[PDB]
Design a protein around this ligand. Structure first.
Ligand SMILES: CCCCCC(=O)OC[C@H](COP(=O)(O)O)OC(=O)CCCCC
Ligand SMILES: [Ca+2]
Lengths: 691, 48
């Protein structure tokens, strides 16, 4: 497919010539010795060649001489040329058939092109098939279209909410597709950066508070509703913004200005003071939170200090619950609670009640989403089991029995064991407070964000352990060897019968990773030396697999995991810190657990009314309680208009700072060189023509 | 239910002409107060 007459014509277009192109176009009319819309050896139409080089003059010649436009508009969109697109609008393909001009324009995120297309009334479909790749490509193109910052500025009367729902959609859909997960995750991260960059353009604290304090009224203030919504969408790079964090920090230290004079011991003494002071500081809010000191604990940081102090006193009582200065007689079946246990019990009820309260506001939706929440749920369940087992011991134990003669599986023993496990969890649970400290914060976050890898790899470790336990039991199944082995088991003074049953083999294979197991467990009470040899070989293979292969692999896995969870260890830590702060912002459970179960001043006026929901008193809440005119919309309308004006300014600033910092700040590619060369060439040809 | 009780204001069809002062006698303009409606018998439904 070639010629010699039209190739000169395409060459005269490609070189930017004007007189020759006009001559060829005018001569094509009288004589059909040339095909105007032909294809060069690379696949370019003459119109497409002119588009590729931003030579609008030859473009309008070709357009006025009715050359087959075809899809040259889309190619103009790709080259983001504005003059060619403007001239084209006033008038086998290379693209997927479902692409419209507006979709492609959104892909390039070019403002001058989105501006023109929307003025022409274009539209974009909205997503929710015998073939699958056409539909999947269409869906991805749609999302990548309306995830462009340029398009969100034009449409999307609420750019923050748009970016938020869109990030949520793509994050939740990158697992449903699961074959394009990279693309969808990239787009979600891109729109998260868009939300952060749009918040960044605020210029006054007044302009910021409105953004963070805004939500739909619907006749249902300033409690950071937008920020809580951003938390709810896991928008962790929107809450790590500097000045937003400054606003939160200012609202956290409202009790006292500064907190920058603090140092190694200056902050310690003021916090230790309140940590000691929380009992009456709490009682004051309990009884008289009018003006004296009730508002002093309502302030957030003081609330945090009182809560952590209450937790530390709980732990102190737990450690002190094992000293013999208070402990009851061991030789007493099911004793009455010791005074330390009596003190401890109000903390148990306080924690149970606060966890029920937290459940009653998340509805097991984000309740399970927090691993700390799961840990404290199991801790409180263990406490409940402890109370139940202790009391059911108390109803029939009668005491007066030495601990060495207690029958196995006695309620007091199991209660004690459960209590101990609950102590373990309780003393562990304070790790969450280290998200607040700016030094253990990121480290604790990285601890959390490689625990999944350890679980994945521990699953393989447990599979290997089961395999080798299977084999070792198969081998030492028959050498029961319990004729003189007093206290048979792995955990004896001689490590006897380590592999004589599946449970002890599981257990022995566990301990061997720590070295706490010895050899000569593989020996048998006979001269069966081959059995001992093969057993020792199997045990050694297990040890080599675990302590030289598997454990080293675990190290080499978390090394790169940490290498890939340090790029966003700060932003993610600040998101977790904000999540911890906002838990103390609200005027909810302001009372630490010891002073929480204490009934409210009414205590019989809110529980009953909320209990009157299965009867006719459920409907007696929206007829007589409310009878006013509901004069709030006039405030709501003005508030919404003010917020809309703020959004308009932020959007205009974001546009003016995305055109001047990203469009003119990228590299210089070969195409720009070609355009400049052809500009010079056309200049030469025209000045030649004029003489 | 529990509806049609809050009609104890002076009316009887309700339009935007007569409520501007009602939220001005106890409240405090046209371009925003007008939106409080923005027809009859819709303000007691879809409130819950
Ligand atoms: C991967 C499984 C290796 C075999 C483990 C094993 O138990 O055999 C050890 C043998 C014999 O020792 P035991 O069978 O353990 O008594 O000695 C070696 O070959 C050392 C090689 C040292 C290789 C590191
Ligand atoms: Ca909790």
């Amino acid at each position: 497919e070639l010629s010699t007459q039209e190739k000169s014509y395409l060459s005269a277009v490609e070189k930017g010539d004007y007189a020759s192109v006009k001559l060829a176009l005018e001569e094509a009319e009288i004589y059909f010795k040339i095909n105007i819309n032909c294809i060069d050896p690379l696949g370019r139409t003459a119109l497409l060649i002119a588009i590729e080089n931003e030579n609008l003059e030859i473009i309008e010649l070709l357009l006025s001489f009715n050359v087959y436009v075809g899809d040259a508009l889309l190619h103009a969109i790709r080259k983001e040329v504005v003059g060619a697109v403007e001239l084209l609008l006033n008038h086998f393909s290379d693209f997927t058939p479902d692409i419209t001009p507006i979709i492609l324009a959104a892909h390039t995120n070019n403002y001058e092109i989105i501006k023109m297309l929307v003025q022409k009334g274009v539209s974009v479909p909205q997503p929710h098939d015998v073939d699958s790749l056409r539909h999947s490509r269409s869906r991805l193109n749609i999302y990548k279209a309306l995830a462009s910052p340029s398009l969100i500025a034009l449409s999307s009367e609420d750019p923050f909410l748009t970016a938020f729902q869109l990030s949520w959609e793509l994050q939740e859909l990158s697992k449903v597709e699961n074959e394009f997960k990279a693309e969808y995750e990239e787009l979600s991260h891109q729109c998260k950066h868009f939300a952060k960059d749009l918040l960044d353009q605020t210029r006054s604290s007044r302009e910021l508070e409105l953004i963070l304090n805004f939500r739909d009224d619907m006749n249902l203030n300033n409690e950071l509703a937008r920020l809580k919504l951003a938390i709810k969408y896991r928008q962790k790079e929107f809450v790590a913004q500097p000045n937003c964090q400054q606003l939160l920090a200012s609202r956290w230290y409202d009790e006292f200005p500064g907190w920058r004079r603090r140092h190694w011991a200056g902050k310690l003494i003021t916090c230790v003071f309140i940590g000691l002071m929380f009992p009456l500081l709490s009682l004051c809010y309990l009884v008289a939170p009018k003006s004296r000191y009730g508002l002093f604990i309502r302030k957030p940081f003081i609330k945090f200090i009182c809560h952590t102090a209450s937790y530390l006193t709980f732990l102190f009582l737990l450690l002190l619950a094992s000293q013999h200065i208070v402990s009851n007689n061991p030789d007493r079946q099911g004793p009455k609670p010791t005074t330390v246990e009596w003190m401890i019990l109000p903390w148990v009820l306080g924690f149970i009640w606060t966890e029920i309260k937290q459940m009653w506001d998340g509805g097991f939706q984000d309740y399970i989403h927090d691993w700390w929440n799961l840990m404290d749920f199991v801790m409180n369940s263990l406490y409940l089991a402890t109370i139940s087992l202790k009391i059911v011991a108390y109803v029939k134990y009668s005491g007066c029995k030495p601990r060495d003669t207690w029958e196995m599986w006695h309620p007091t023993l199991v209660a004690e064991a459960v209590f101990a496990i609950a102590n373990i969890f309780s003393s562990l649970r304070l790790i969450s407070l280290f998200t607040a400290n700016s030094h253990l914060g990121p480290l604790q976050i990285s601890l959390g964000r490689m625990l999944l890898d350890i679980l994945k790899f521990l699953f393989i470790y447990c599979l290997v352990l089961l395999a080798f336990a299977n084999g070792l039991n198969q081998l030492y199944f028959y050498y029961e060897n319990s004729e003189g082995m007093t206290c048979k088991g792995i955990r004896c003074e001689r490590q006897n019968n380590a592999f004589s049953t599946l449970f002890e083999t599981l257990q022995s294979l566990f301990w061997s990773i720590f070295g706490l197991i010895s050899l000569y467990v593989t020996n048998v009470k006979a001269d069966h030396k081959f059995t001992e040899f093969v057993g020792a070989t199997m045990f050694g293979t297990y040890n080599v697999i675990s302590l030289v292969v598997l454990l080293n692999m675990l190290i080499a896995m978390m090394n790169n995991s940490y290498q890939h969870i340090a790029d966003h260890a700060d932003i993610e830590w600040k998101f977790a810190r904000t999540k911890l702060w906002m838990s103390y912002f609200e005027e909810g459970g302001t009372l630490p657990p010891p002073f929480n179960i204490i009934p409210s001043p009414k205590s019989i006026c809110y529980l009953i009314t909320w209990i009157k929901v299965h009867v006719f008193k459920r409907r007696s809440k929206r007829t007589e309680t409310f009878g006013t005119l509901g004069r709030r919309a006039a405030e709501n309308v003005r508030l919404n208009h003010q917020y809309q004006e703020v959004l308009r300014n932020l959007v205009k600033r974001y546009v003016a700072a995305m055109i001047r910092d990203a469009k003119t700040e990228e590299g210089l590619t070969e195409e720009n060189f070609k355009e400049l060369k052809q500009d010079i060439s056309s200049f030469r040809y025209e000045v030649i023509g004029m003489m | 239910e529990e509806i049609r009780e809050a009609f104890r204001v002076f009316d009887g069809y309700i339009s935007a002409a007569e409520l501007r002062h009602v939220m001005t006698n106890l409240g405090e303009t046209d371009e925003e107060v007008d939106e409080m409606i923005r027809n009859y018998e819709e303000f007691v439904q879809m409130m819950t």
